[PDB]
Amino acid sequence: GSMLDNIQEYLGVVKAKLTEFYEKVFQNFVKSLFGKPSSILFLGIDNAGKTTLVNKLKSDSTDVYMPTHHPSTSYIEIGNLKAQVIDLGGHTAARLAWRDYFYDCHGIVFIVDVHDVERFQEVREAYETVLSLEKRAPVVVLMNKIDLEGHTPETAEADYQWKSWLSQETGIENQEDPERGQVVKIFYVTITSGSANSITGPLARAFKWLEAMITYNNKKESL
Amino acid sequence: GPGSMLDNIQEYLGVVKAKLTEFYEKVFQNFVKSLFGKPSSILFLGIDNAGKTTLVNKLKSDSTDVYMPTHHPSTSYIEIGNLKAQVIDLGGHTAARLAWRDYFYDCHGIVFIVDVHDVERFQEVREAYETVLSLEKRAPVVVLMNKIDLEGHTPETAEADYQWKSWLSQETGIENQEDPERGQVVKIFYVTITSGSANSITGPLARAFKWLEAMITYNNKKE
Amino acid sequence: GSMLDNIQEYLGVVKAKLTEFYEKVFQNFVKSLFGKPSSILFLGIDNAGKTTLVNKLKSDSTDVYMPTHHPSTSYIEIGNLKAQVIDLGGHTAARLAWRDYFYDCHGIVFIVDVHDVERFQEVREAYETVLSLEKRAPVVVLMNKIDLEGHTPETAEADYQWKSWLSQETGIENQEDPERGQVVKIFYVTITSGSANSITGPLARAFKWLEAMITYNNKKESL
Amino acid sequence: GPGSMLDNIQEYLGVVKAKLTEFYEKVFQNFVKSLFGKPSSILFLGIDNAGKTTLVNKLKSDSTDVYMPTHHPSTSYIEIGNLKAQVIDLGGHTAARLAWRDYFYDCHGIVFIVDVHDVERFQEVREAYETVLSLEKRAPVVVLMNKIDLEGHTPETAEADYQWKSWLSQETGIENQEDPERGQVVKIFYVTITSGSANSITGPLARAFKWLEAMITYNNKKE
Ligand SMILES: Nc1nc2c(ncn2[C@@H]2O[C@H](COP(=O)(O)OP(=O)(O)O)[C@@H](O)[C@H]2O)c(=O)[nH]1
Ligand SMILES: Nc1nc2c(ncn2[C@@H]2O[C@H](COP(=O)(O)OP(=O)(O)O)[C@@H](O)[C@H]2O)c(=O)[nH]1
Ligand SMILES: Nc1nc2c(ncn2[C@@H]2O[C@H](COP(=O)(O)OP(=O)(O)O)[C@@H](O)[C@H]2O)c(=O)[nH]1
Ligand SMILES: Nc1nc2c(ncn2[C@@H]2O[C@H](COP(=O)(O)OP(=O)(O)O)[C@@H](O)[C@H]2O)c(=O)[nH]1
Ligand SMILES: [Mg+2]
Ligand SMILES: [Mg+2]
Ligand SMILES: [Mg+2]
Ligand SMILES: [Mg+2]
């Protein structure tokens, strides 16, 4: 009996260090994606998971939130990522108040709570608001909280009925051809899962796609 | 480059974390086999859907322990080292209170499992428990109030919710009798059998088995 | 460049936890070897590695050295292991001063520094002293510091010339048959290596052999 | 039982620790490949037995980098990403100071390695260094005083031993010239190339390469 003493506590301590390490790799990978300072707007209605995502990207040691004066906004510099977070509302013409935030905007991360179906009308208005203020920058869409529908990223990608219904209710559609103008790509994620830190998982591939599209814009504007 | 090296680091960290998790479970399995120094007939009892098969699957080692075919669909049997585990699905209303009497021959201890969420079936639980106590008047009885996670409880917050503990005893008829000098003993533990922490050899689930073994040893000292 | 930041520090932290864990398993395995309190004498001339070995076995949290008044002796209780350490000297008839330490002695660990060849005469006298004061208890011999000869336990075991020369110079010979009287078995170890914590390595097998021989004595004295 | 479970835990901890050690080395290898953004001819120089082949083997990735056959037995050549590593074993007394001149065409930097323990060959080192400086009058020179472990030094205690540092400079003729405004630059680093900590991307060995790359970039800014 005494031979099992503390074995489990050591397994737990090691597992905890492995989890911190796993998260650190994600933070490093994302921080290294942006070679020049890039203004990224994290947008969506409240409770979608924006603050959760930005907290996932930041290093608690080096990155510090800056005070904004509007309660709907957040700002933190994560290496070259200048992350501006905005809780949208929708269904208002006072959307022009935010126009300054889209000056020299490099990319957008738009987050949707797929579980909060009743607020899909706000989402489509919030999304319509974004597309009218920013007409050039790439938009990556995170369909978040798929775990609340019992989905992983793999089973969600195969649920073609549900993907069509989500696009129908929010108005968000893919436009993955950069020759055809502004680009939009939808990803299905659970931002709070531990596997979301995988640098080959959908969340990380969404940032790699966004970065590649920002690089396409920077090369096209130079020619 | 370095990108392919960090993906290999992350993939390896996950493989290791899963293997350490498997070891954490094996420690629980070895702890249980070492509790019983002589062959002991333990009856795992309760109405169906309470978590009996789940608990016994958690106790067994998939390599060496094999379920044996029984004739009744309500019964299961597996030898886990010296733990001779007899599982019986009780339940429903019936005048056949004697139907299971033979299974109590040379019974050493009872694990009685209750689903604390299924409040509608508490009358079946109360009848099942009364049936058990009328067939076994000597062996120690450990009561697992299971599925406390469905009430938003951990084992720690469950133990402090004296109001809820009294209500469970009132509705099922199950009461503590922890004095071995006063006759047959009963002790209630509050657990979530499907949780990973249920594998902790210092957790309530493991303390319930250590308490049961200590009571079986106390009884054997008198005999 | 920033993508490699702190990756190495995490690999080092995890490796350090793995090393502590590896050592803890050895401490648990050895502590569990002795089911009843057992007086084990750790003997040899000074600088052989006795204090190093006992420090390797103890848990710094629970096990505490007790003050002795002779500077040549040490005593610590490690679970059921009552470890009495004595720096021998040899070449003196005042060896009878230590006779009390061999009353109810259960086993002996005799340690030799294979590198300190010039002091082999003290070792043989120290060894002769031991065999004259204790004529019943099993003796396990650790030929220690084999790394200073460029040996691992495997290459040392194959160096039959050097094993013969060590036995010739110290007078220590094997007697592994318990029917033929007192038993002696020689093991080749590097007590300071990390692999010496392996519970299937020579150091651990030496303690398992000693325990089995003590059990043979206890069964023979009961018949 | 539990004994076979702890041996499997220990064996697994060792397998993991070795794989983490391999990853620690791969981080060093990736760090070196990422230092050189353009093809750079680096000459690794010194008398034989100084540690040149050991250093270059530490830099290369065994999967992708392959030594190419040279015609002289004193020379080695391997392309490690953009690092074009030319190794030349200098040494002995000779009037053939021009023999290696062709290898200095388009030379970008020099790594000159000295064995600090082989004091008898310090005159060969001094002649080798004088030969090098007469063939290359522009490229930055990083000097690795290697094998400091044989003097009982770590990189930290070596840096504070100003008496020993002055003696090494006096006996080999190697002096620091860290001002790039004052012409060709030389910087001395104190390392143990065979140690595992030599893989640290914040250690002296890695700082020597970062210093050399910074000097190559400073030179290229003028050209
Ligand atoms: N189940 C689940 N909850 C999530 C997920 N992402 C975020 N949340 C939760 O959603 C809540 C609101 O998130 P938050 O980042 O504060 O929202 P926002 O800043 O207003 O967009 C928090 O309790 C998060 O833990 C997800 O993928 N799954
Ligand atoms: N939420 C929750 N589900 C549980 C728990 N224990 C068991 N279950 C689930 O309850 C269901 C019935 O369990 P089972 O072991 O088959 O019950 P049995 O009829 O008593 O053998 C299964 O789907 C289990 O996964 C628990 O602690 N929490
Ligand atoms: N190289 C080497 N040194 C060892 C080994 N075992 C012990 N030592 C060293 O030997 C020295 C004396 O050991 P110690 O335990 O103090 O000796 P004792 O108590 O007088 O027998 C210490 O510096 C130990 O680190 C070994 O296997 N290899
Ligand atoms: N002790 C010690 N040995 C080293 C060190 N670096 C290299 N060596 C050893 O020195 C010997 C000669 O090294 P090598 O790389 O072949 O030298 P080269 O002739 O300059 O190519 C080898 O046996 C290496 O293991 C060091 O830092 N410390
Ligand atoms: Mg927020
Ligand atoms: Mg069942
Ligand atoms: Mg000592
Ligand atoms: Mg060489």
DSSP of A128-184: HHHHHH-SSS-EEEEEE-GGGGT--HHHHHT-HHHHHHHHHHH----B--GGGSS-E
Residues A47, B39 contacting (CB under 8 angstroms): no
What residues contact residue A216 under an 8 Å CB cut-off, 6+ apart? A178
Consult the annotation and say whether D205 binds a ligand: no
* DSSP classification of residue C159: -
Question: Is C10 touching D (CB cutoff 8 A)?
Answer: no
Q: Residue B141 is inside which H or E element, if any?
A: strand B141-146
Residue of A nearest to C18 (CA): A14
Distance from Cα C49 to the centre of ligand 7, integer Å: 7
Q: What are phi and psi of C150, to 5 degrees?
A: 75, 20
For residues A42 and A109, is the Cβ–Cβ distance under 8 A? yes
Interatomic CA distance for residues C204 and C198, integer angstroms: 7
For A48-105, the DSSP string reads: SSHHHHHHHHS-TTT--EEP-SSTTEEEEEETTEEEEEEEE--S-SGGGGGGGGGTT-
Strand, coil or helix: D117: coil
3-state secondary structure of C134: coil
- Exposed/middle/buried for B61, CB within 10 Å: 0-12, 13-18, 19+? middle
Residue A183: HSE in the Cβ half-sphere, 13 Å Cα cutoff: 19
Q: Are A48 and A111 in contact (CB under 8 A)?
A: yes
Rounded Cα distance, A173 and A163, in Å: 10
Of the bound ligands, which one is closest to the alpha carbon of residue C46?
Answer: 3
Q: Do the Cβ atoms of D141 and D129 come closer than 8 Å?
A: no
- Ligand 3 centre to CA of C149 (Å) is 14
Q: Is the CB of D204 under 6 A from ligand 4?
A: no
Cα(D67)–Cα(D82) distance, integer angstroms? 14
Pairwise CB contact (< 8 Å): A7 & D3: no
Residues of A in contact with B13 (CB under 8 A): 18, 21-22
| Residue B6 assigned to a binding site | no
Q: Using CB atoms and an 8 Å cut-off, which of residues 32-61 of chain A contact chain C? A: 32
What span, in angstroms and rounded, lies between the C-alpha atoms of B102 and B28?
Answer: 31
Q: Do C18 and A17 touch (CB under 8 A)?
A: no
Residue pair A4/B27 in contact by the 8 Å Cβ criterion: yes
Q: What residues flank ion ligand 8 with Cβ within 5 A?
A: D 53
Q: Provide CB contacts within 8 A for D153, sequence distance 6+.
A: D161, D164, D190
Neighbouring C-beta atoms of residue B116, cutoff 10 Å: 26
**Phi (first) and psi of residue C85, to 5 degrees:** -105, 130
Question: Chain D: nearest CA to C199, how far in angstroms?
Answer: 6
Q: For residues A89 and A45, is the Cβ–Cβ distance under 8 A?
A: yes
Q: Does A94 touch chain D (CB under 8 A)?
A: no
B168-176, Cβ contacts within 8 angstroms, sequence gap of 24 or more = B168/B114, B168/B116, B171/B119, B171/B122, B171/B126, B172/B114, B172/B122, B172/B125, B172/B126, B172/B129, B173/B126, B173/B129, B173/B130, B174/B112, B174/B114, B174/B129, B174/B143
Contact A76, A54 (CB under 8 A): yes
Determine phi and psi for A176, rounding to 5 degrees. Answer: -90, 0
Which chains sit next to A, with 3 or more Cβ pairs under 8 A? B, C, D
Q: What is the DSSP letter of D175?
A: -
Q: Tell me which residue has tokens 């391999």.
A: D22
CA atoms within 13 A on the CB side of B145: 30
* The Cα angle at residue C129 between residues C125 and C135, in degrees rounded to 5: 140
Distance, CA of C151 to CA of C158 (rounded, Å): 10
Residue B2, judged by CB atoms within 10 A of its CB (0-12, 13-18, 19+), counts as buried
Which residue's C-alpha comes closest to atom 12 of ligand 3? C47
If phi > 0 it is left, if psi is from -120 to 50 it is alpha, else beta; for residue A34 that is beta
The arrangement of strands across the sheet holding C38-45 comes to C65-66, C73-78, C81-88, C38-45, C107-113, C139-144, C184-188
In angstroms, the CA D61 to CA A20 distance is 28
Question: How does DSSP assign D72-107, residue by residue?
Answer: STTEEEEEETTEEEEEEEE-S--S-TTTTGGGGTT-
First-residue to last-residue Cα distance in chain C: 73
How far, in Å, from the CA of C119 to the mean position of ligand 7?
17
Decide if B196 contacts B21 (C-beta within 8 A).
yes
Alpha carbon separation from A143 to A113, A116, A118, C100 (Å, rounded): 6, 11, 15, 79
Pair A203, A23: CB distance under 8 Å: no
> Cα–chain-centroid distance for residue D37?
19
Give the end-to-end CA distance of chain B in Å, rounded to a whole number: 72
- Rounded CA separation A9/B27 (Å): 11
What is the rounded CA–CA span in Å between residue B132 and residue D16?
50
Instruction: Answer whether D80's CB lies under 8 Å from D63's CB.
Output: no
b/e sequence D141-173, b meaning 16+ C-beta within 10 Å:
bbbbbbbbbeeebebeebeeeeebbeebeeebe
D80: nearest CA in chain B?
Answer: B1
Show the tokens assigned to B126.
């109360």
The secondary element (H helix, E strand) that includes residue B179 is none
Q: Residues for chain A: how many in total?
A: 223
Sign of CA dihedral D157, D162, D165, D167: negative
Measure the CA–CA gap between C119 and D55, rounded to whole angstroms.
41
Whether the CB of B3 is below 8 Å from some CB of chain C: the reply is yes
3-state SS, residue C184: strand
Residue whose tokens read 């978040």: A144
Contact C164, C24 (CB under 8 A): no
A49 alpha carbon, closest ligand: 1
C-alpha separations of C91 from A41, C115, C174, C185, C216 in Å: 85, 21, 23, 24, 33
- Rounded CA separation C72/C65 (Å): 14
> How many Cβ atoms are within 10 Å of A182's Cβ, its own excluded?
15
Within 8 A of D3 by CB-CB distance, chain A residues are 3
Q: Are the CB atoms for B110 and B208 separated by under 8 Å?
A: no
Q: Decide: B49 in ligand 2 pocket, CB within 6 A.
A: yes
CA distance linking residue C125 with residue D131, whole number of Å: 62
Residue C2: CB partners within 8 Å, gap ≥ 6? A28, A31, A32, A79
Q: Are A222 and A50 in contact (CB under 8 A)?
A: no
Cβ pair B22, A15 in contact under 8 A: no
- Residue D9 CB partners (closer than 8 Å, separation 6+): A7, B23, C25
- Following DSSP, what letter does each residue of B40-72 receive, concatenated? EEEEEEEETTSSHHHHHHHHS-TTT--EEP-SS
Q: Which residues are registered as beta bridge partners of C38?
A: C81
Resolution (angstroms) stands at 2.4
The span from the first CA to the last CA of chain D, in angstroms, equals: 72
On whether the CB atoms of residues B205 and B191 are closer than 8 A, the answer is: yes
Q: What are the distances in angstroms from CA C93 to CA A95, B197, C99, C109, C128?
A: 101, 62, 12, 22, 12
The number of C-beta contacts closer than 8 angstroms across A and C is 48
Pocket flag, ligand 2, residue B149 (CB < 6 Å): yes
Are D193 and D124 within 8 A, CB to CB?
no
Pairing of strands B109-115, C139-144: unpaired
Ligand nearest to the CA of D67: 8
Query: In this complex, do A8 and B34 lie within 8 Å of one another by their Cβ atoms?
Result: no
